[PDB]
Subunit: 330 residues, 6 copies
């Protein structure tokens, strides 16, 4: 089938759903990759090497969304793309439909089959396509948190790792998840005195192991938390699905309250497309139909099909007819 990779049109979005690496496997494996001119240009990928790997570069998004059996995207269709949604195609991308009835409706109103990146889940309840983004995000939280600590940024005026004879910043990472673990790693590498708080003692246990006790760990509690933040020069909320610190101290969620992987497209594109690669294939090969019964992880992401809503949590958050996944998969 002819797969399509259109140019992300959303605001401040410079990523691309595929790399010359994935495109190269689609091609030399029996498929046709329709890539829109400049789609990857935004994350340092010209069509020069996109073609030197296999890319049926086309001029407009119209031709891309058309003749493309599988449309790989990074973000969900925006306003002007609704009139694009085909019925005989498969939309594989980040949807957050429970965040857009308008979006959800347009996918049902167009009867297109779609799979949401964020809900593809494996056995241990893991979310593979979100993992990379959490990694990119957490490492960024630190680089961004460190910069905003500059007095010029309205920060306290403290250097992440100080200098000889002078103390470094005291960084607090709330949570030892992918993001919390990656945030501490960088802040620590930059020289800050990082302490990570979690309620899960095994996560804290391995952090002690990983940095021979260099990255401090404190059992997380509302009392420990409040205590740790008072002292903190920078705090990172790495806890992913009302209280304050000192003047000049920074707060980065995932005083200057700061608030992503779009910031580093080259990186993030690869990070995600590498996680996406195996599924895009299972899709391009045997179709979303055989791809979802042969793989309950990719299936768990099914979002819509010919006016069908295949996600209860969403049909719940908005109150709409739920159409069991098992049934639309025969």
């Amino acid at each position: 089938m002819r797969v399509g990779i259109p140019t992300e049109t959303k605001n401040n979005e410079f990523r691309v759903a595929i790399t010359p690496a994935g495109v190269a496997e689609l091609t030399r494996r029996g498929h046709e990759v329709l890539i829109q001119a400049g789609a990857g240009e935004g994350s340092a990928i010209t069509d020069a090497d996109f073609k030197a790997a296999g890319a049926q570069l086309v001029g407009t998004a119209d031709q891309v969304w058309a003749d493309a059996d599988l449309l790989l995207k990074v973000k969900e269709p925006i306003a002007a793309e609704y009139g694009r949604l085909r019925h005989g195609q498969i939309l594989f991308t980040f949807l957050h439909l429970a965040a857009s009835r308008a979006c959800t409706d347009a996918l049902l109103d167009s009867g297109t089959t779609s799979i949401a990146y964020e809900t593809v889940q494996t056995a241990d309840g893991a979310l593979p396509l979100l993992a990379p983004m959490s990694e990119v995000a957490g490492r960024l939280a630190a680089q961004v948190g460190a910069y905003h600590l500059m007095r010029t940024q309205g920060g306290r005026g403290v250097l992440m790792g100080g200098v000889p004879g002078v103390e470094p910043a005291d960084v607090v990472v709330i949570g030892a998840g992918t993001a919390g673990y990656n945030a501490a790693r960088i802040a620590n590498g930059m020289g800050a005195t990082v302490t990570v708080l979690d309620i899960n003692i095994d996560k804290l246990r391995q952090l002690d192991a990983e940095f021979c006790g260099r990255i401090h760990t404190r059992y997380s509690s509302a009392y420990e938390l409040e205590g740790a933040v008072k002292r903190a020069d920078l705090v990172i909320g790495a806890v992913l699905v009302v209280a304050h610190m000192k003047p000049g101290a920074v707060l980065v969620d995932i005083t200057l309250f700061y608030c992503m992987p779009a910031s580093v497209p080259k990186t993030s594109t690869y990070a995600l497309t590498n996680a996406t690669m195996p599924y895009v294939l299972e899709l391009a090969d045997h179709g979303w139909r055989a791809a979802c019964r042969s793989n309950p992880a990719l299936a768990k992401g099914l979002s819509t099909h010919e006016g069908a809503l295949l996600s209860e949590r969403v049909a719940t958050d908005l109150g709409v007819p739920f159409t069991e996944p098992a049934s639309v998969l025969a």
Copy 2:
């Protein structure tokens, strides 16, 4: 004696010439410490700190400059500060007089004894009070270069240390010097693929030793510098492909005042020993019994003593060893 420290007026300057530690060691040797209200507020040293430490918190600058037998600054007196200078006062701060004919004149026409932080020099030819600024400046370059590397800062869009399975950023530091060693250190801690360039292979060996091979080294030929700079994401000038960031420390960018809370201690921790030799024995005694301090002396009783600053502005030299 009484030493005074006025709040810096230089726009965008957040450092202070003394910390609660210094304003506590002078107070212990029989000295009255005068500090302007709000002197170290921009570097997190409230008057409370300076106060309950033995320091006298005067209302404004006037009171500081009037009394202060020795005055401690970070930057030199700026334009609107020329009327403050006193004949019988010892000014201690970064002067860079060889950069402003206007500054030099005010101190000269002033008859003030000023000693420059940046020219103070020990035996090995080291600049003690200027070295801590190169440490901060070196670490900052990396934190900053990593920041402007973001697509949204004009940068290419590369995370310093990538993420598993995805290639890390390519950093090139030119100079195995004090600042370069700091940039590579931090850039390396961010996960980045760092390489340092230098024609001093002795420095290449200690960097090889320290980071045990993780931070790459390349003899600095103009051939490699070019090739190295062609492939990089961030190049740090501690002595280009589209979107690369070049930070130059002396997308583009060309500082220790950005992190005042950090650099105040760094500078005043180096300055402290001299501020002491000055508060106890005078500029004459101090500078007499200490050559490194002697080398910083810039002006006194109308004289301009400096073969670099003097053979710059076309002025009469004065053997600093004479006034000594």
Copy 3:
């Protein structure tokens, strides 16, 4: 029962099926260990300490294979040993019968009960007795790959870790398995700039953790692969169950194409006998009979019994009557 450890007679084979350590537990636990003179001499083990631990040193292989209830071996019997295979004994060793009908036939034609080292498997599908060999192998791939990089060896003429101001080799490890992980470890320790490629992102994830990003990881793809090898000074195929690189660059599988734990017997003997120890015991204690129903991992290795073929994959690769394992175990 009297266990027997004969001298490996195969070519270039200097290993031994047991160490004074294991022999010491066989003895002071109720059994008799019949070790052939010089059996361990080949891997730095004289009979001096073999007896100082418990060893009924005997002169020839004939007496060893005879009176020995359990014959522990490292390699499969060769030409002259066929006339040795008893019917009332147990052959526990590496067989690769699917690689030798002649060998397989001789074990059936002699009606001997045997268990193959390479097919003993645990729950997570793991192969314990092969693990150590993969470790030895991978660490060797690097030491051997580094030596063959010497211009004198016909190599490019590059030192693994270069010297101050000069660049090290660029080493590529294909695969993050036991072997791939161990290969990167040594090459990295030797100073090379190693990059490991894998399709399994968790393996890459932990390699980043283990060396704080010092050992580079790149999602493995046929495009990434080809790209990585072009640059490479040395490449190690650590992928265990047609394209080229630069002149002088080395290739080591598991330009100079090089091709094992027999290379370092002292090491490998211990490596394997340590993994073998627990089973040899379960065998020597309760017999292969009770040893295989009480332990499905050791049972999964059963190969033959009194003319019986207890391994389908083998009976398949050669087309021969398959005799269900469950049945020959009552």
Copy 4:
């Protein structure tokens, strides 16, 4: 010649002035090595070791002191050992004569040529034979401070490096010196949160470099020392809140003889080269062709040569360069 080593009689001293290695390099240059039976038993060097190495194992001390042309000790002759001293003997050991008028007299009234381990000195002003004792002394302080930190030792009740989720211990080492560097090293390896204080910022940089930031550094102001010491669990004096432990190396505690097996080699490994220059050429030749050894010479033919030890006990000085 023949060099002799007697068992130390100083109570609680377990070191020996020579190891099987030294008693084997002298034996190879045509020297008879006499060692008392049981000399190095308290540091794990049985007579078997000393014996099957080329050493002569005499019955007791008398035989050692009588024969020994050069005598090697660790501590100085104690009270009951004054009758042992010989006019024509070279005593080599830690003497601290400037601490005992009584000791100095026995060697003086003795006419013995004694050379002090602690005053021997090379160019850079280093004390070669005294340095290894500061390494051991530094590492011991941490092992000990970590021990007395236990509630049952009077200490507060803190594990040096805590455990995951629980805060680690706070260690403060005062002095970036040889001993301080060792304490921080070990205290840091125990998981503890270590900080070193010093007014020598050059030492602060090498500690920063070495442990790459894990061991904290703070310019030693009397202000920080206090604040630092106020928050600590264990403070090590290598130059307080309830239950804190302060170890002072020169709950409280104020040494290399505690781990004799370790420190014997450390000391005798530094001493060895000199014991050789002494056994081959004599105190005269050796001390002549080697200034560092010349600096250790303390007594000879009744003379007391030392501007520190002499201007202490009120005695006549003797130009060591004269007797040379």
Copy 5:
């Protein structure tokens, strides 16, 4: 319900069943925390911050054991506390009843409901509340073992990490469990040449990974063991549910034979109360009744209830009527 935290009265016991952290969650979550004056004072916790977090400080132990719905303790009641055991309360603490019929009887004779800290077990058979103690213990074994190596302590007279040009001690850790892993970590950090012996090759495998082969590993055997201890300057028995070494060499179990987390209360109190926190809550919230059927891990710790013995192993070790856990939980 009103929870109670009494002052440990046992000998040389300076720990406390709760920290201002846990007490803070009990309070600002709907409960009343009755803490006895000075209960925490012994492990550096005054009532100053105990109240500044929420503590109904009371004068005597009598009032504490009274009006307290849940009595959190570190150690089992001693002689004078028997007359304290209420019937309408819950005793959550370390019991070791199989070590005290007197103790066991008193809990049955008082009909109190109790849950033993040491038998709360999770799915992978893990014992969470013992883990922290094993960590504290193992790290101590090393600090204590290193001190007792001092000739003054009657030891051989060897410094853990020697000094330049001179060798460090040779430390042997028997077992790679929590305690064995933590013992090696510290001894190694102190500079000793540590070698860890285990029969479980995965534990040895990860120790190699964790310290890049710096902490030596040797497959554990009675022959390897005896060999390793001969050389050893210090040995730590980290193997938790008759042979000798050199003169001056130390032995620490978990020559100077030495024989705990009470040694470092500040540490250990937090270590354990952090592990205890989640259960104390599940208890204080829904009662031991709903707390044990909703959580089979905490339930597996049930020890007694109104004259009932809810632990077979104990009723076995002493021979007493066993009263099935499932039945006393409806």
Copy 6:
């Protein structure tokens, strides 16, 4: 001027006296760079590299030696190369003239100005151009010793770093020198249990510091060396039980040309600065304004200047300071 580099003819030599970087910095100072076709092919520097860099690729050696005002080599002219030498030519390369009476004569009878790489010497008594060869030589010894340790190489049959649960290899490096430090470094990275021996305890401390205790150190007594060497698997001579491998760098084995791609840059990166002082000012000027270069001068206008090479072959000395 024009500097020339001929392909090495010495059998088994794969290094080249100049890299594309050097042949690019000389070309920038107005110099014609002549390089023989295939000069750096054995070290991966095709003529393409040398070409598109500013270098003149001559057909063969004749053209190189004829023109070249300064000639750069790695090894000295061998037998069949004696007819190439020119009176008015500056030869720069490793000469070891004090090793071949025959070599010395050809340069002497030649009237050529030759400067030896190995005798060039800076203040600290360091041999700049010879040091990089000891780094390579040190790392190679370990890679090689680890290789010949294989049962199939005659070795004992030990993997350098063992495998979990199995004991690692025992490495002994004799010499804390530049080469020894490199061998221990690499041998340690291979997982091996490394120990370094030296009578210079200062070097023992930096190795202790660097690898923080993982690489063992032992004072070099002849007693320990023996005991140490008795227990080893691989001993590296950077200054035996059956199957042990002893590599000696100056089963047995007694080098930088083995990894030409690496060592060419290493040597030419050190040589480069001198090749420059030579191409710009001449052997006279260069050697004049630079003592380290002055120390390398070996022959000129028929003279043989060297108190080591001259008092070897029984020849007349010529004050190098005279011809200067």
